[PDB]
Amino acid sequence: QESVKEFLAKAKEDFLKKWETPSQNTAQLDQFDRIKTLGTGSFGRVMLVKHKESGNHYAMKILDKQKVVKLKQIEHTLNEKRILQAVNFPFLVKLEFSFKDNSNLYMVMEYVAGGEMFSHLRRIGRFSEPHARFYAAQIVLTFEYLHSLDLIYRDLKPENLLIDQQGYIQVTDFGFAKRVKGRTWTLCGTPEYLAPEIILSKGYNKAVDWWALGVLIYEMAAGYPPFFADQPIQIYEKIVSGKVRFPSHFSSDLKDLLRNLLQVDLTKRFGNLKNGVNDIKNHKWFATTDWIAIYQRKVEAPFIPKFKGPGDTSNFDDYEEEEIRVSINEKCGKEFTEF
Template sequence: MEPEYDNRHYGNGEGDMQMNGYMNAPPSGALPQHNHGHDHMDVPPPTNGAHLGYELTDFALLKTLGTGTFGRVHLTRFKNTEQFYAMKVLKKVEVVRLKQVEHINSEKQILSQIHFPFIVNMLCTFQDEKNLYMLLEYVVGGELFSHLRRAGRFSPDMTRFYAAEIVLAIEYLHNLDIIYRDLKPENLLLDERGHIKITDFGFAKKVEDRTWTLCGTPEYLAPEIIQSKGHGKAVDWWALGILIFEMLAGYPPFFDDNPFGIYEKILAGRITWPTHFDSAAKDLIKRLLTADRTKRLGNLRAGSEDIKRHKWFRGVDWDALVRKQVQAPIIPVCAHPGDTRNFETYPEPGDEEDATGGMDPFRNLFRDF
């Protein structure tokens, strides 16, 4: 009998928002004068901090795709080209009040450095008196979380496909000394062809060795984060083990009604294995969920190659996968580039008073925007 599992408990870490699926775009056009010669890419590369002179009036804000502690994400249309994007809007006064300035600037810096097939691309940023704006691809397929809940659980082949694309994305980030730290189905979007796009880099951090911040989603936290021992890249491989289990089972291996109960179960390390798990899947998950990070798969001498060579991934064509030449198991229903049927519906914001009175006391805190 499968346990009942429904709610997700969110931690209070470095992340800017706990957004439910938003971001990303069909392989359509770039913003004007923003191609940099990369014609082979689906979208233009990051702008590395350039705001390109855009203002909010250049865009039509459409439906809300996600909400968070101090902002929301809108489907938006660039008026000059009619292209659709996701616009992340963050209230400066709330970012400052919640002491998230450093983390928002870090997220912006990290997103400006990365460009990979399975990671959401940031196109530009800008600011006005009240808000910070991050323009991102719009990914029409919605959250993997929604597709998983609808299916109940995924087959081994489906799980393997998504896990393999995630392995490549984490490998890419780790090669740049970036820890992601928030791997979970809610932060995985599907593009129009069904491929993974990792979104929400609010917890991501560039670190060469170790960091000590408690952050993430309780069910996915590695023991070393809970114990404040200092943590590094190995936490992403632990989270991969949790994710593979959840995709195969329909629920994570450690859950409880409150975060502290979850932490106790993670530290105890006892897993009840569903009977339909095969031996290769169990072996991979056990190796990823090794409490001793010095023995955890992905954190050994061969790094991510150990994971890619594991018998559970046998038959995966990694080169074809990174080129998106492998057929995805789910092709999202999408009638047009601005289709939002794969996202939840949120109340739309009303007109808000300008608490700053037209002044911008925080501009110097966000110079990179």
């Protein structure tokens, strides 16, 4: 709490500015060669693109102006830009450019090849307590950083946790994020990581985040996640009851952390407590972990992926290809003047 407070404040400012002044138009579609579709969205597509000049692949999220309105996702779609545009941190995915064209919007991040976590996890089976720790140590620092900027994250999961050439992580998709102060009431995110506040809908807060950190971990360490059924409503009652079963192989300090996070009471849940993050940051489980090396990305990674070369999409899925349409007249240029 010496060096780890000069930052946060130093870091809260840097951000503020950007926050409060976002470059917009920074490129045009043509500067890029569309290579391949990476991930999806009900309001866009994330695909692989090669920058003409600098043979640098990036990754282009492209939301269609007309699909984001039917879901008013505007309010949102605008801060994801404003955030990535101001947010700044190692474990955060870099935004390089943002432009819009007649029809749909574009955010162009750095390309994290290694592939999304959710998959290695399913491939491998589960993670070894350390392995999981390696990651967690990265979320904790991450949410420490964020939370300090009045930014709940709202959408933590393995599909958002991408893996770089050095097994470290970068979280993508700030599409649910929200700079706030106090309570907010939006029901957003996968039913599986839903803190039980959200479920009743009684204005949650950053606390819902730390809760997802547990679900994160549990699952990282078990494969399966704590709460899970077939159909959503079911998973719902499950969560509120809060009866969690630990697999036999859980370390003891694993099972400790957990039930502190997976705490159906905010007013008694690490992350929400008066000692703040230091409750977690100090939990035995993190005994060995050196909070700087990680940070400083000086630590040697447990895992890795093999990249055949620059812009290798092996670690990724195969989706159906589509075009990048651009009707002839500025469709929906009203609501997106900020973009």
